[PDB]
Amino acid sequence: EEDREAVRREAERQAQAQLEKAKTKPVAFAVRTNVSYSAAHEDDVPVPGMAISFEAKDFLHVKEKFNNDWWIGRLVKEGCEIGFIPSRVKLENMRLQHEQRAKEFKLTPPYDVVPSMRPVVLVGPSLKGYEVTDMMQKALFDFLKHRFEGRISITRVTADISLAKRSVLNNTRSSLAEVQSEIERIFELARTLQLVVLDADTINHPAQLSKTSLAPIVVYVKISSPKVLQRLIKSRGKSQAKHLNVQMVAADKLAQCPPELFDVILDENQLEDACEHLADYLEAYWKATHPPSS
């Protein structure tokens, strides 16, 4: 078992070399996992112990391809460095192997391409297009413009991106051609790993983007008390007091929406504190996608 380890030791040395250079290379593409994976019990791994494990719904940045079974990349989490990631074919084969084993007792798809930076989307306090909500979101946008100036892009999205259901695109106001055009734009904005914030007028609920391929960071601008909301709108004149109704319910709908559908929830009494809470979240997200050795 001496001459055998000869070839293996070298391949492992080469694999390591490629893994190292990849640390600074850019992100070819990002994926959201639909299944979990553990390298805990396997061989066939280029550099023993360098395979990355993940749970379903995790985000991965794929930098380059090693071979038909492994890609090189990292998990998007602070401190996580480059590592080997199983390829789609590899995961599918593992699915087959496990099924065979299951039958021997005689008792889809794993990755979704996603933008390299999760686009930030704001919903709440109520309906967009009006004022209470528009002004409060407009505030957060200006804050983010400065807090992350030089590393962020805030772009308006008129096209109804809520029509961008994976299945639909894989096959109404805006047209699919226009939507697809915007998704591409979103994807291309996050390419260089800069922070991407969207001002999507058609999105008031997280469910409108659940089936899409944007995997956004849904930010819930929540005003805890309904009374606070009511008063707030009233102080906008009859040009808003009339449209009052369509604002309380919309707000109440978000209020009943399960927190899981939200990534961040801004329910601070002071607007200055909402900003800082978001900045902190984005600052950590920024670190999860950037940091040391790149």
Which residues in this chain contact Hg ion in the complex, by CB under 5 A? 52, 75, 80, 83
Sorted by sequence, the CB contacts under 8 Å of residue 289 that are 6+ apart come out as 61, 76, 116, 117, 193
* Residue of minimal Cβ distance to Hg ion: 80
Nearest to 32 by CA among 111, 108, 88: 111
- Residue with smaller CB distance to Hg ion, 83 or 216: 83
Task: Report, in Å, the least distance between residue 182 CB and Hg ion.
Answer: 32
The least distance separating Hg ion from the CB of residue 49, rounded to whole angstroms, comes to 11
Cα(113)–Cα(120) distance, integer angstroms: 17
- Residue closer to Hg ion, measured from CB, 49 or 150: 49
* In the complex, least distance from residue 55 CB atom to Hg ion, rounded to whole angstroms: 13
Cα 98 to Cα 229: distance, rounded to the nearest angstrom: 54
Q: 2: which 2 tokens? A: 């001496």
Give me the least distance between CB of 91 and Hg ion, in Å please.
17
DSSP letter for each residue of 22-45: TTTS--SEEEEESS-B--TT-S--
Beta carbon nearer to Hg ion, 84 or 220: 84
Phi, psi (degrees; rounded to nearest 5) at 6:
-65, -55
- Pairing outcome for strands 195-200 and 120-123: parallel
On the 0-12 / 13-18 / 19+ scale of CB atoms within 10 A, 240 is middle
33 or 174, CB closer to Hg ion?
33
CB of 124 to Hg ion, least distance (A): 34
Q: Which is nearer to Hg ion, 24 or 175 (CB)?
A: 24
